[PDB]
Each structure stands twice: as C-alpha cells, then as structure tokens.
C-alpha cells in the first residue's frame, strides 16, 4: 500500500521539482536579463577600457 503511494505520488514530486526548477529557471532568466541589460550599457562603451 505504501509503495502504491510511492508511485502515488512521485509524479507529483516530479511536478513539484519541476516547479522548483522552473522557479530557478525564471530567476535565472530575469538574472540573465539583468546581465544582458548591464552589459549592454556598461560594456558597450567600457569594452574600450578593456580593448
């Protein structure tokens, strides 16, 4: 019985792990957006300091 409930529900746990994953991916998307945003204004001209 407990094993039936092992199967029920790890589909759900897979789903909750998927939500956590998606949460992390979204944070990273926003964070990557901050990175693209900062790069576009900082390095666009500051790349000259470097090169």
């Amino acid at each position: 019985k407990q094993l039936q409930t092992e199967a029920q529900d790890l589909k759900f746990v897979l789903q909750k792990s998927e939500e956590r994953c998606l949460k992390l991916q979204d944070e990273n998307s926003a964070l990557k957006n901050k990175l693209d945003t900062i790069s576009a204004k900082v390095y666009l001209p500051s790349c000259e300091k470097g090169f």
Binding site: L10, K11, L14, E18, L22, Q25, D26, N28, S29, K32, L35, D36, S39, Y43, S46, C47, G50, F51
Partner: protein
C-alpha cells in the same frame, strides 16, 4: 601495427576530416602530424595559455583552439601562419567555440547562455544568438550543413532555433515539445529534425524542419530513457538507446520502431548468441624476450551470464559500416560489449573483457570493432573471429583510455594523459 614515437605531452588529440592530420595538444602547444608522409611533425602552434579544446575545420586547413580561463579563441590557418585571428570579445566570456562548416566561421559561446555570437573569419558579421542553451550540445548541423538546429532557451522554454547556415540567420524558429532538450540530430536525408528530449521523458520528437511534429517515440512518462541515440549510415535508420538496457530500432522511413533489442544478461537466450572473452595468453610466435604475460581475444561459449545513475543505460548505438551491426554495451555491463546483428535483430558476438570497457569504435569500411579499455591493447571484434593488437614496449605503460579512429580507417590515435600513440594497426584490409 606501425608506430610512431610516444608523443610526449599529448594531453589530447583530434584528427582531421580527411584523416591526414593529427593534432596533438600539449598544454602550451599543438603539434600537427602528417600521417601520410610518416607519423611526423609538420606545424606547431604555441601559446602562452592553457588549452582545453581544439577542432579541425572540415577542410583541414585551420585549427580552432580554445583557451581555458582566459576566454580566448585562437584561430590558426595551417597553410598560412600569417593568418592568426583571435576572438577576445571577453566581457561576456568565451566558454567554448565550434566551427561553422563552410561558412568559414566560428560559433563562439559566451557564458550564461547569453550569446553564441557568430564570428565570421572573413567579415565578423556578429549576429546575436537569442540565448543559446548550450555550447556543443544541441548544436547540430543538417547532413548537408544547410541548417543548424540549436537548442535554445527563452521564457524559460526550450525551443530550437533553426538557423539557415549560409546567411547564418534564424528562419524556422520553433517551440519544441520538450521538457529539456538534450541534443539535436538531423535525419540523414534532412527529412526531419530528430529531437532528443531529456532522459526523464524517454522521448524523441520528430519534427519536420518546416512544420513541427511528424512523429514521436512515445515517452513512458515516468522513466528515464533516451540515454543515447544514433543514426546509421544507411539511406536512413535510427536507433535509440534507452535507459532500460534496450535499443529502439526505428525505421525512419515511417519512423516506426521495428524492434526492441534488449541486452539482458543471458547470452544463451539470444537465439544467435556467440560469446567471446578476453583471456590470458602468451605471445604469438616468433616472439622472443619481449616477455609474455599477455592476453588474446578468444571465443568462450560457455559463458551465459554476462558482467541508478550510470547503470542500465544503453551506452551506445553505434553503427558499423553499412550498419549490419550495432555496438552498444550497457552501463550495467562494465566488462562487456554487446553487438547486435541486423538484419537478424538478434544479439550476436558478445564480448567480455578483462578490462572494464572504456569505449569502442566501429571501423569505417567494415567492422573490426575497436574496443579499448585502458590496457595498452586494442581488442577487436574481428569479423574473422577475433583479434588483439598488442601495443609494444614502445609505450609499454600506455593505457589507451581514449581512442580516435580515422575516417580513413587506417590511422589510429591512442590517448592516455600527456601521451599519445599514433599508428597503423593491422590494416591491410
């Protein structure tokens, strides 16, 4: 086997498309050898940096070398030492790079899935990549190189950018039905994009490059699968290595599973089983003081029982010349190579080793499956029963942990640590 010297410093190596050159990477330099002249040096590229990756362009005229935590891509034209180009667009990182076939260009991957800016070597033309998912994985060229399918991620959703490679531009941008793209393959006739999803879903998504799904190799929803996949060099045929010790052989004409080939453990249960093993021996005659304490590859039919994470995975689905055999092995068989025979679609020529298998390669031009396992020996599934190529004292301790094998299947490259053995195996053919 004909041998060159033991190449010192050969941390790693690659060989050229036409198989004429071998590039040996030393931490500070690349040694290039023209094997046809002899297994001797031609050019050397050196740098004050640490090299982690190199690639020959598919014309074998230049080598792309990518430097470690220096984010530097260095490009050297072998036929023109005056053509030295570098990509030092370092603010974003230069984590990797690959060659773009006849576009004469480098796809350089920035960090954080930001850009995979294309750097034309003739004119830069630096088109941005809309958040590439990976460096090499997921970057796959069509068989004629017309299109490239790039795993990409936006709006945290995987999709495949379809790049038309001549203009290196996005054309059929497409949302892929995946949870998490692993890699991308193109059909041999470029009739579809075969998309390899995450192992979690066990699925292959077959998409027409012009319309989305054609078919799907059904997921099992909750099991790991699709551990590996390969397309045979037949007009077309693909087989999917799952993660349940089974290969789904799919006829790409209809995209249907023709069969399921399971590795099991019981040799006797395969109707056509032939089992071999590596076994202790003495040297061949007329050997002298070279000593003995060696092995040979022999038939031993008596053997029936053969020996989470990296277990039960199909380790390969590699096809032989004209694909009459599939070498596969399982993560569950650290000591053996399974060779499936097709058209029988039955297991035959099951090889056990005394050395956990590190890998194998079908030779182009027939079979003679090259099997290596870090033993200073090349074992082969010779069609004519069995063969072992002993490596000499000339590299006595060389392990052979990695093997490259030339498309012009004459030259073998054996790699260990800072050490390479280059030669011409029993290749009279």
């Amino acid at each position: 086997m004909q041998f060159s010297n033991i190449i010192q410093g050969a941390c790693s190596a690659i060989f050229s498309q036409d198989s004429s050159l071998i590039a040996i990477s030393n931490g500070s330099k690349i040694l290039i050898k023209d094997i046809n002249q002899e297994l001797i040096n031609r050019n050397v590229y050196s740098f004050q940096d640490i090299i982690t990756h190199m690639e020959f362009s598919p014309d074998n005229q230049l080598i792309l070398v990518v430097q470690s935590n220096s984010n530097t891509v260095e490009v050297k034209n072998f036929n023109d030492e005056q053509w030295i180009c570098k990509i030092v667009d370092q603010a974003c990182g230069l984590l990797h790079a690959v060659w773009a076939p006849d576009s004469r260009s480098i796809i350089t991957f920035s960090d954080f899935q930001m850009k995979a800016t294309i750097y034309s070597l003739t004119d830069k033309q630096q088109y941005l990549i809309k958040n590439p998912k990976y460096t090499d994985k997921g970057l796959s060229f069509s068989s004629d190189g017309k299109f490239m399918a790039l795993a990409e991620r936006r709006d945290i959703k995987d999709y495949i950018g379809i790049y038309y490679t001549k203009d290196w531009k996005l054309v059929n941008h497409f949302q892929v039905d995946t949870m998490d793209l692993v890699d991308i393959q193109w059909s041999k006739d470029d009739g579809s994009i075969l998309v390899w999803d995450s192992s979690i879903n066990y699925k292959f998504l077959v998409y027409h490059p012009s319309n989305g799904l054609i078919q799907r190799i059904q997921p099992y929803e909750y099991a790991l699968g699709i551990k590996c996949v390969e397309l045979s060099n037949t007009p077309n045929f693909v087989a999917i290595g799952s993660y349940d010790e089974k290969i789904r052989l799919v006829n790409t004409l209809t995209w249907k599973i023709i069969t399921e080939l399971e590795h099991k453990a019981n040799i006797k249960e395969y109707s056509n089983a032939v089992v071999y093993r590596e076994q202790n021996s003495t040297l061949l005659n007329a050997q002298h003081l070279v000593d003995r304490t060696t092995t040979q590859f022999v038939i031993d039919e008596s053997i029936n029982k053969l020996p989470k994470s990296q277990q039960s995975g199909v380790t390969d689905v590699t096809f032989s010349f004209n694909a009459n055999y599939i070498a596969s092995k399982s993560a569950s068989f650290p000591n053996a190579v399974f060779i499936w025979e097709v058209s029988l679609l039955e297991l035959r020529y099951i090889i056990l080793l005394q050395n956990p298998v590190k890998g194998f390669l079908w030779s182009h031009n027939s079979n003679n499956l090259i099997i290596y396992a870090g033993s200073n020996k090349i074992y082969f599934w010779s069609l004519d029963g069995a063969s072992v190529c002993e490596l000499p004292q000339y590299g006595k301790q060389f392990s052979v942990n990695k093997v490259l094998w030339n498309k012009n299947s004459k030259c073998l490259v054996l790699i260990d640590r800072r050490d390479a053995i280059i030669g011409y195996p029993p290749i009279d053919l």
